């Protein structure tokens, strides 16, 4: 299965200019496009190698669409300010995330379209792709405007049509990286803390996609509650890193095993500290 998602952030800044609009697009865990309205000349830009092969009608069409969106979102910020009777002095933010998910055969599994105002849910398109869920009285004004204006019928046509068609295309074009799971490079490090304890750290480095399970076991017993598990972090090279550490009593190190499950691994790995 695969997904395509766009993320929009629209932020006002009174006394500091017009609102800022930033958009990013992803296929699975790979950022592939970006747009920022603060840029001297704002443009939808590539962020992954396999999208660089899209022609200029693509980039221009996307830039036009992003600017019209930035404009709709600045108006939306003013509308929200009136709906909420807020002061013109405060900075406010609208966020949006939408896209489609496809199955292994490429058929639309699910469409998404959610918006937030000041970090809170505002309105979302339902799974039926024909109705909206509004979070408050202000969002109901929007919902009624969207029902009158047949917005859901338009979004459905986008999600079932263009969204799916384009994702299928991106997956074929990026097949070598998007459809080839990179397994983690693993190792266990040992760090005495004192003469009686030591940290065992299990590393999973350079993996793709982000989804991974890194766990420690002591004599085949899961240590989730005692494991310091850092949030999956970008390595900066489109791959991910994660580590799970356990503080262990000196002399117990050989009883600890780290277990790594990832798409790119045929069979799960089992690692120990190798002195």
């Amino acid at each position: 299965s695969h997904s395509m998602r766009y993320f929009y952030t629209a932020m006002s800044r009174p006394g500091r200019g017009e609102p800022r609009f930033i958009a990013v697009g992803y296929v699975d865990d790979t950022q592939f496009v970006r747009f920022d309205s603060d840029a001297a000349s704002p443009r939808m830009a590539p962020r992954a190698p396999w999208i660089e092969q899209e022609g200029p009608e693509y980039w221009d069409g996307e830039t036009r669409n992003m600017k019209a969106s930035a404009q709709t979102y600045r108006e939306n910020l003013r509308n929200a300010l009136r709906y909420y009777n807020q002061s013109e002095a405060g900075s406010h933010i609208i966020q949006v995330m939408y896209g489609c998910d496809v199955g292994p055969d490429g058929r639309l599994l699910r469409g998404h379209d959610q918006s937030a105002y000041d970090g809170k849910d505002y309105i979302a398109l339902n799974e039926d792709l024909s109705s909206w869920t509004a979070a408050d009285t202000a969002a109901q004004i929007t919902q009624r405007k969207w029902e009158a204006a047949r917005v859901a019928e338009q979004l459905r046509a986008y999600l079932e049509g263009l969204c799916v068609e384009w994702l299928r295309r991106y997956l074929e074009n990026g097949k070598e990286t998007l459809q080839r799971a990179d397994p983690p490079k693993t190792h266990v490090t040992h760090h005495p803390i004192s003469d009686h304890e030591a940290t065992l750290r299990c590393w999973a480095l350079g993996f793709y996609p982000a989804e991974i399970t890194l766990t420690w076991q002591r004599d085949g017993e899961d240590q989730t509650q005692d494991t310091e598990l850092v949030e999956t972090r970008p390595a900066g090279d489109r791959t991910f890193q994660k580590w799970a550490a356990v503080v262990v009593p000196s002399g117990e190190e050989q009883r600890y095993t780290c277990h790594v499950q990832h798409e790119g691994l045929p069979k799960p790995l089992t690692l120990r500290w190798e002195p």
Partner: peptide
């Protein structure tokens, strides 16, 4: 490809 649908609040 991004949505062309106008979402006026």
């Amino acid at each position: 490809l991004s949505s062309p649908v106008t979402k006026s609040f």
